[PDB]
Design an enzyme around this catalytic site. Structure first.
Site, PDB file in Angstrom:
ATOM      1  N   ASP C  43     -28.999 -66.595 146.934  1.00 21.07           N
ATOM      2  CA  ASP C  43     -29.346 -67.994 146.754  1.00 21.07           C
ATOM      3  C   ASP C  43     -28.507 -68.591 145.622  1.00 21.07           C
ATOM      4  O   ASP C  43     -27.598 -67.951 145.088  1.00 21.07           O
ATOM      5  CB  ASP C  43     -30.849 -68.136 146.503  1.00 21.07           C
ATOM      6  CG  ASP C  43     -31.336 -67.272 145.359  1.00 21.07           C
ATOM      7  OD1 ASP C  43     -30.516 -66.537 144.777  1.00 21.07           O
ATOM      8  OD2 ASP C  43     -32.543 -67.323 145.044  1.00 21.07           O
TER       9      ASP C  43
HETATM   10  C1  LIG Z   1     -34.762 -71.335 124.692  1.00 24.27           C
HETATM   11  C2  LIG Z   1     -35.687 -72.426 125.226  1.00 24.27           C
HETATM   12  C3  LIG Z   1     -35.214 -73.107 126.524  1.00 24.27           C
HETATM   13  C4  LIG Z   1     -36.064 -72.772 127.779  1.00 24.27           C
HETATM   14  C5  LIG Z   1     -36.933 -73.939 128.337  1.00 24.27           C
HETATM   15  C6  LIG Z   1     -36.801 -74.220 129.867  1.00 24.27           C
HETATM   16  C7  LIG Z   1     -38.110 -74.066 130.712  1.00 24.27           C
HETATM   17  C8  LIG Z   1     -37.995 -74.373 132.241  1.00 24.27           C
HETATM   18  C9  LIG Z   1     -38.848 -73.479 133.199  1.00 24.27           C
HETATM   19  C10 LIG Z   1     -39.603 -74.235 134.334  1.00 24.27           C
HETATM   20  C11 LIG Z   1     -38.756 -75.226 135.179  1.00 24.27           C
HETATM   21  C12 LIG Z   1     -38.672 -74.924 136.685  1.00 24.27           C
HETATM   22  O1  LIG Z   1     -38.625 -73.795 137.100  1.00 24.27           O
HETATM   23  S1  LIG Z   1     -38.638 -76.353 137.864  1.00 24.27           S
HETATM   24  C13 LIG Z   1     -38.483 -75.887 139.674  1.00 24.27           C
HETATM   25  C14 LIG Z   1     -38.251 -77.116 140.590  1.00 24.27           C
HETATM   26  N1  LIG Z   1     -38.554 -76.918 142.020  1.00 24.27           N
HETATM   27  C15 LIG Z   1     -37.811 -77.472 143.067  1.00 24.27           C
HETATM   28  O2  LIG Z   1     -36.841 -78.173 142.787  1.00 24.27           O
HETATM   29  C16 LIG Z   1     -38.220 -77.199 144.513  1.00 24.27           C
HETATM   30  C17 LIG Z   1     -37.123 -77.362 145.597  1.00 24.27           C
HETATM   31  N2  LIG Z   1     -36.068 -76.344 145.512  1.00 24.27           N
HETATM   32  C18 LIG Z   1     -34.721 -76.674 145.271  1.00 24.27           C
HETATM   33  O3  LIG Z   1     -34.471 -77.868 145.134  1.00 24.27           O
HETATM   34  C19 LIG Z   1     -33.620 -75.580 145.187  1.00 24.27           C
HETATM   35  O4  LIG Z   1     -34.025 -74.682 146.159  1.00 24.27           O
HETATM   36  C20 LIG Z   1     -33.566 -74.839 143.821  1.00 24.27           C
HETATM   37  C21 LIG Z   1     -34.953 -74.362 143.417  1.00 24.27           C
HETATM   38  C22 LIG Z   1     -33.024 -75.821 142.795  1.00 24.27           C
HETATM   39  C23 LIG Z   1     -32.594 -73.560 143.881  1.00 24.27           C
HETATM   40  O5  LIG Z   1     -31.493 -73.846 144.568  1.00 24.27           O
HETATM   41  P1  LIG Z   1     -30.641 -72.597 145.626  1.00 24.27           P
HETATM   42  O6  LIG Z   1     -31.752 -71.587 145.772  1.00 24.27           O
HETATM   43  O7  LIG Z   1     -30.324 -73.461 146.816  1.00 24.27           O
HETATM   44  O8  LIG Z   1     -29.463 -72.159 144.781  1.00 24.27           O
END
Ligand SMILES: CCCCCCCCCCCC(=O)SCCNC(=O)CCNC(=O)[C@H](O)C(C)(C)COP(=O)(O)O
Ligand SMILES: CCCCCCCCCCCCCCCCCC(=O)OC[C@H](COP(=O)([O-])OCC(O)COP(=O)([O-])OC[C@@H](COC(=O)CCCCCCCCCCCCCCCCC)OC(=O)CCCCCCCCCCCCCCCCC)OC(=O)CCCCCCCCCCCCCCCCC
Ligand SMILES: CCCCCCCCCCCCCCCCCC(=O)OC[C@H](COP(=O)([O-])OCC(O)COP(=O)([O-])OC[C@@H](COC(=O)CCCCCCCCCCCCCCCCC)OC(=O)CCCCCCCCCCCCCCCCC)OC(=O)CCCCCCCCCCCCCCCCC
Ligand SMILES: CCCCCCCCCCCCCCCCC[C@@H](O)O[C@H](CO[C@H](O)CCCCCCCCCCCCCCC)COP(=O)(O)OCC[N+](C)(C)C
Ligand SMILES: CCCCCCCCCCCCCCCCC[C@@H](O)O[C@H](CO[C@H](O)CCCCCCCCCCCCCCC)COP(=O)(O)OCC[N+](C)(C)C
Lengths: 52, 56, 88, 69, 175, 178, 459
Positions: C43
């Site tokens: 991915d």
């Molecule tokens: C040192 C301190 C810094 C740390 C702080 C940071 C904390 C952040 C942690 C929580 C944030 C998240 O996870 S927020 C997760 C957001 N969810 C979505 O966007 C659902 C739809 N999925 C997609 O758009 C793509 O599949 C994708 C997932 C982008 C992958 O891409 P590929 O699979 O096509 O490569």
């Protein structure tokens, strides 16, 4: 630059130094003060008669 | 052959000639201000047996 | 002197070394033209981790716009060679 | 390997520098030699009292030969 | 040396202690001084001897210029331009001479401060006193004249000071 | 730095960029390798927890929350590669870079040394002079009537064409010029 | 001193009789010879001045100014022959004629023994400068620049003429020696106040005093390079020379009439230095630099002390040399790229290293690095001001910091960074330009070696 460096002493710096050495020698030996506050002899000055 | 050389580089004597003419005119101007020659209280001097004027 | 004159063969060897130290990629099934999404079934996050691993190996960062595009080890090697002025 | 190093033309700056050095030295080495020769073989005058009846020339009031000249 | 008068620029009699070695070790400073002497001071001395030999074969003298004393600015009429000119020139020469006198005194003071070392605050009292006296006199004579100074302005300053002193003396007499 | 940008970034592009930034700053905080691996695996699990959200509104809300958390918890002095735009050697060798046109003004005595290099240079200049008009005309053909909409350039397609606007990309000074 | 005046008048027909292809050579050679001759004027006395005749005299204040004028003529000739190559022979001869006439008027101005003759020459210097600016300038703003230069000057200078003729009717003479010997104090009356203002405002506008300087950026930017050289190096010093001459008869009124001009000078010094920090035109920056330095000179002349006069003389000479060098340095880049914008051509140290060295030395002398005569003058003026009042050090202190800032800003913007990619017509520096910079800079350090030659009569 050479001409300006070797210009003759028309500013009379060394002459003034030698004259001052003579004057200091003469005044030191005689016990006279090195310098005088008045540069003009008061005998040739005539103050106004009345100050009141 | 010096004809062309002279007619090409005769403009090189104007400035030195002006310099010597200015020197001459300065001497002439100095000649008209001798009203106090050997007459100042600081530099008044008896003449030497041969010389005529103390400065020119 | 300084570091040796990096060559394309060395770049490819190091890229393949890093990729074969990856647990999610089988060593023999990996080839220099293997695609990350199609052939290897990774991915986007795995591609990001691979790009960061390349950055660590060569000591220089790769811009995100450029990084997103590379999909096979050939593209990674080509980008590295073009960046560091490697012609032999 | 040995690669070509691209630089701007350093010919003209070097030419100007050597021309300036040449002309400055051309006129300043004779002057330094003459000053040294004058100082060694024609020293400075020695301060002395004016003898009675003598009137010194105006240039006789300075000590360095070049300044006097 | 005899280049300058030692009365105008005096110095103490220069007492220096004799060396008293107390160690079996050699003194590296003495060895280095012997080397410096034999290697630097002798060739320089020979060059100076040659230069002085050449100088002695061409000896000429230059004379200090003498100036007579002319009438001062006090003996000049109000609009007499020539007498004023001579008086102003003489006054300017005297101003230069006074500056050189102050310079000599300051040189004495600086030399004393360097020479006396850690005891300068006590051992340089006389030079400091002389400088204070000369500075006071010089300040009275020329300070506050400003640019475009002349003998007339100095005379005006002196007259003002004399008037103030006379008034102060007469008022103190009435006390 | 080499690719033409797009009009905007997509949601997945933003998520990937935030993931890279968070991993880098976490590595800055976790100096040692094993601790970094532990917390990087934790971060990856946290990122892929909400990977399957079909509501884009809540996805962007989560992205907003994650960006706010990153800004609160970022390293004030993060590690930068020495030649990256904030590194200690970012533009160190820019003063040694000299454009190639400066060689046209060398004195003939300077060009007397290096004859073969200047022969190759003349060949390259002739190549550019011959290819310019074909490049211009290809750009004229491939450009939409309302002007270009991106900064991407077409390649060469014909027999011995060259990709248009190539001279200043091919003849870059170097990365370590002197 | 006709031994200097007559050779210049001979430069005139020498130029007008030369072959079409030898005018520059002949003019340069004979200008340099005239400068060598004028070098003899530095042998000055300690008490009075050299009184050549009833008409001309040389002091220890005007001799360095004359030497600077005669030395500046050949430099202007070298700087002009590049951009005048396409001009016809007659117009080139007319340009050289304008320069020669300007030098002649300047030489006679600094040695005139009377104030009316000095006025006539100091006003005759206007015509050649105005003609040069309005005829050989490049842009359409040159006409307005000429008008500003003319009327700012004349509106100050005409009341001076009225005051001078009035003074001659009152005291019977305008000869400077008689004026000095027969000086009388000025009372405190409205007539005397307006006489003071009439005698001072022309020289104030020549410096120029802050608030009366708007003509200077226009005239110094719109002029050709020789015009800028002579406007910055010599023509601004006419005000200072005239003010030090005229202040002899203004005491004791100056003691309090100097306050508004002192406040204007100090605050406007701060303001013009600050203006130099945000300037898009490279020549306007040098012009505002000139304004700041001249404000310092005004302060020194107004406080009327020997140290301030010494500092004023040294600063005037140093500024003339430095500002002329800076103008030539900017003109080289302008001739290369045909634009005055400072951020257009950058990273020039990579392309022109020796010119970068010249830039560095010029900007180091601009900020008064010791022991340059720039710093000698600035420090003498600062000490005199501190004696005048201990609070001036704050304003003076701010100025020193700001001057360094904008000087190095100019240097870093023009020489460092990366060269603009699109500019490919930056040819190597010619021998002429390098010789011009060297002839500007070497006399500065040579004068540092012997600073009593530029310290004025109060030394
Ligand atoms: C040192 C301190 C810094 C740390 C702080 C940071 C904390 C952040 C942690 C929580 C944030 C998240 O996870 S927020 C997760 C957001 N969810 C979505 O966007 C659902 C739809 N999925 C997609 O758009 C793509 O599949 C994708 C997932 C982008 C992958 O891409 P590929 O699979 O096509 O490569
Ligand atoms: C390259 C160019 C590139 C561009 C750059 C820009 C260039 C611009 C240039 C523009 C033009 C400028 C021209 C300037 C004109 C000014 C000339 C002038 O006035 O001369 C003044 C001055 C001459 O003084 P003077 O008033 O004429 O003489 C008065 C006396 O009557 C004399 O006393 P005396 O009777 O003892 O005679 C001494 C005599 C003889 O002295 C001796 O012989 C004795 C010396 C010691 C030797 C003793 C031991 C050695 C021998 C021993 C062994 C042999 C003998 C035994 C044999 C057996 C061996 C065992 O020596 C001399 O005559 C003086 C030397 C001549 C110098 C003249 C300078 C002219 C320059 C003009 C040209 C300008 C261009 C430069 C080109 C020049 C060439 C490069 O010359 C000097 O400069 C002297 C300086 C040396 C002093 C020592 C240094 C002290 C250091 C203190 C500071 C420490 C801090 C660290 C800083 C160090 C930095 C140095
Ligand atoms: C202090 C050391 C004493 C040394 C003793 C002998 C000194 C002889 C020097 C004669 C005068 C210098 C000529 C000026 C024009 C420059 C020549 C040139 O165009 O370069 C081509 C030439 C050819 O090489 P290139 O491969 O083509 O390089 C061209 C590239 O552009 C790349 O060129 P670059 O990257 O190599 O840069 C060129 C260089 C040259 O650019 C310059 O900026 C040199 C001009 C000095 C600064 C001018 C404004 C500052 C005001 C100070 C006034 C002092 C002058 C005193 C009177 C001198 C009379 C001539 O600039 C620098 O490297 C750094 C400049 C910063 C200087 C900081 C020092 C501040 C004052 C320190 C004390 C000064 C008073 C001494 C006594 C104090 C109490 C004991 O370059 C050189 O050979 C190197 C230049 C030599 C450096 C001289 C720096 C120290 C000298 C200061 C004044 C001399 C004092 C003498 C009294 C004895 C003590
Ligand atoms: C490119 C490479 C550069 C670096 C390599 C250079 C190599 C070394 C050369 C550098 C020389 C170092 C300088 C060190 C100083 C030594 C010279 C010094 O001693 O001479 C001074 C003398 O210098 C001159 O007096 C100053 C020169 C005069 C400057 C006038 C400029 C000429 C006119 C040009 C146009 C004018 C424009 C400005 C208008 C005002 C001493 O003055 P003074 O204390 O007395 O001498 C006492 C003994 N006397 C009196 C018997 C002579
Ligand atoms: C933008 C830059 C331009 C250049 C700047 C030029 C500077 C010019 C400023 C002139 C300085 C002083 C001028 C007059 C001296 C004193 C000024 C006056 O205000 O002081 C009091 C004067 O008192 C009152 O102020 C009366 C004057 C009031 C009328 C003057 C008009 C001022 C308004 C401002 C107009 C702006 C002028 C500049 C135009 C641009 C002193 O009291 P007094 O003892 O009784 O008068 C002294 C004269 N005595 C001895 C003969 C009697």
């Amino acid at each position: 630059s050479t001409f300006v460096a070797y210009l003759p002493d028309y500013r009379m710096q060394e002459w003034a130094r030698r004259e001052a050495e003579r004057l200091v020698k003469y005044r030191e030996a005689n016990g006279l003060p090195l310098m005088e506050s008045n540069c003009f002899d008061p005998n040739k000055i005539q103050l106004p008669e009345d100050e009141d | 052959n010096v004809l062309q050389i002279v007619r090409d580089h005769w403009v090189h004597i104007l400035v030195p000639v002006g310099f010597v003419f200015g020197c001459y005119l300065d001497r002439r101007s100095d000649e008209k201000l001798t009203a106090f020659r050997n007459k100042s209280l600081l530099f008044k001097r008896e003449l030497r047996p041969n010389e005529e004027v103390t400065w020119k | 002197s300084d570091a040796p004159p990096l060559t394309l063969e060395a770049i490819k060897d190091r890229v393949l070394y890093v990729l074969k130290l990856y647990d999610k990629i089988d060593p023999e099934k990996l080839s220099v033209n293997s695609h990350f999404m199609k052939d290897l079934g990774l991915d986007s996050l795995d591609q990001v981790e691979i790009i960061m691993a390349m950055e660590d190996e060569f000591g220089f960062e790769i811009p995100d716009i450029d990084a997103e595009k590379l999909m096979c080890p050939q593209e990674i090697v080509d980008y590295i060679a073009d960046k560091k002025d490697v012609y032999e | 390997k040995r690669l070509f190093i691209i630089k701007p033309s350093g010919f003209y700056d070097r030419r100007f520098l050597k021309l300036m050095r040449f002309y400055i030295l051309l006129t300043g080495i004779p002057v330094a030699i003459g000053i040294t020769l004058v100082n060694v073989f024609i020293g400075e005058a020695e301060l002395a009292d004016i003898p009675e009846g003598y009137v010194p020339e105006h240039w006789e009031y300075f000590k360095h030969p070049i300044s006097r000249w | 040396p005899d280049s300058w008068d030692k009365d105008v620029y005096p110095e103490p009699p220069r007492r220096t202690p004799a060396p008293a070695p107390q160690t079996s070790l050699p003194n590296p400073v003495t060895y280095l001084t012997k080397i410096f002497d034999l290697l630097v001071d002798r060739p320089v001395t020979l060059a100076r001897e040659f230069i002085e030999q050449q100088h002695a074969k061409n000896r000429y003298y230059y004379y200090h210029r003498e100036f007579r004393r002319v009438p001062d600015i006090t003996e000049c009429e109000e609009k007499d331009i020539l007498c004023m000119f001579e008086a102003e020139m003489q006054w300017r020469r005297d101003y230069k001479v006074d500056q050189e006198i102050v310079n000599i005194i300051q040189e004495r003071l600086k030399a004393c401060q360097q020479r006396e070392g850690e005891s300068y605050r006590q051992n340089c009292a006389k030079e400091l006193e002389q400088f204070t006296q000369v500075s006071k006199a010089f300040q009275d004579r020329y300070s506050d004249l400003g640019a475009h100074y002349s003998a007339r302005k100095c005379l005006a300053k002196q007259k003002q000071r004399m008037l103030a002193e006379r008034k102060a003396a007469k008022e103190a007499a009435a006390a | 730095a080499f690719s033409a940008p797009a009009a905007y970034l997509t949601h997945q592009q933003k998520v990937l960029r935030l993931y890279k930034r968070a991993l880098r700053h976490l590595e800055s905080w976790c100096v040692h390798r094993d601790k970094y691996r532990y917390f990087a695996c934790l971060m990856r699990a946290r990122f892929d927890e909400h990977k399957n959200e079909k509501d884009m509104v809540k996805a962007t809300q989560l992205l907003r929350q994650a960006e706010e958390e990153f800004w609160y918890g970022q390293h004030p002095q993060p590690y930068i590669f020495p030649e990256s735009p904030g590194g200690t050697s970012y533009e160190r060798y820019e003063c040694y870079k000299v454009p190639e046109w400066c060689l046209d003004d060398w004195h003939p005595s300077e060009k007397a040394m290096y004859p073969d290099y200047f022969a190759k240079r003349e060949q390259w200049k002739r190549l550019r002079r011959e290819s310019w008009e074909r490049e211009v005309k290809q750009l004229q053909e491939e450009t939409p009537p309302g002007g270009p909409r991106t900064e991407a350039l077409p390649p060469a397609r014909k027999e011995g064409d060259l990709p248009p606007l190539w001279w200043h990309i091919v003849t870059r000074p170097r990365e370590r010029p002197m | 001193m006709l031994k200097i005046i007559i050779p210049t008048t001979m430069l005139l027909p020498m130029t007008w009789m030369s072959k079409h292809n030898m005018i520059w050579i002949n003019a340069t050679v004979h200008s340099l010879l005239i400068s060598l001759i004028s070098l003899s004027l530095l042998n000055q006395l300690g008490e009075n001045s050299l009184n050549f005749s009833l008409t001309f005299f040389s002091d220890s204040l005007s001799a360095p100014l004359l030497v600077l004028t005669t030395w500046l003529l050949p430099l202007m000739l070298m700087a002009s022959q590049s951009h005048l190559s396409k001009e016809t022979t007659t117009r080139k001869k007319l340009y050289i004629t304008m320069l020669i006439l300007l030098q002649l008027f300047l030489i006679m101005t600094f040695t005139a023994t009377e104030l009316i003759l000095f006025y006539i020459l100091f006003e005759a210097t206007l015509v050649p400068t105005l003609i040069i600016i309005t005829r050989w300038g490049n842009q359409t703003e040159r006409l307005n620049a000429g008008l500003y230069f003319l009327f700012y000057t004349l509106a100050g200078s005409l009341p001076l003429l009225v005051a001078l003729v009035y003074i001659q009717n009152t005291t019977g003479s305008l000869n400077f020696l008689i004026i000095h010997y027969w000086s009388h104090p000025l009372s405190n009356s409205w007539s005397n106040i307006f006489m003071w203002l009439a005698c001072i405002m022309a020289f104030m506008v020549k410096m120029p005093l802050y608030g009366l300087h708007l003509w200077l950026p226009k005239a110094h930017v719109e002029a050709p390079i020789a015009g800028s050289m002579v406007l910055a190096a010599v023509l601004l010093k006419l005000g200072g020379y005239g003010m030090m001459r005229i202040t002899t008869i203004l005491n004791p009124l100056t003691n309090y009439m100097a306050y508004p001009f002192l406040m204007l000078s100090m605050w406007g010094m701060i303001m013009t230095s600050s203006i130099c920090l945000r300037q898009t035109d490279l020549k306007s920056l040098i012009a505002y630099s000139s304004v700041s330095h001249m404000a310092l000179v005004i302060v020194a002349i107004m406080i009327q002390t020997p140290w301030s006069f010494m500092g004023a003389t040294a600063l005037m000479i140093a500024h003339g040399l430095t500002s002329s060098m800076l103008f030539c340095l900017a003109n080289t880049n302008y001739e290369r790229v045909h634009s005055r914008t400072m951020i257009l051509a950058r990273g020039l140290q990579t392309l022109l290293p020796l010119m970068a060295t010249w830039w560095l030395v010029a900007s180091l002398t601009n900020l008064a690095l010791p022991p340059s005569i720039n710093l000698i003058g600035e420090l003498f003026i600062i000490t005199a001001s501190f004696s005048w009042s201990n609070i001036t050090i704050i304003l003076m202190g701010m100025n020193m910091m700001i001057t360094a800032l904008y000087s190095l800003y100019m240097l870093i913007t023009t020489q460092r960074g990366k060269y603009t990619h699109h500019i490919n017509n930056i040819k190597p520096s010619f021998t002429r330009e390098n010789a011009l910079m060297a002839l500007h800079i070497l006399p500065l350090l040579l004068l540092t070696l012997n600073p009593k030659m530029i310290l004025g009569p109060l030394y």
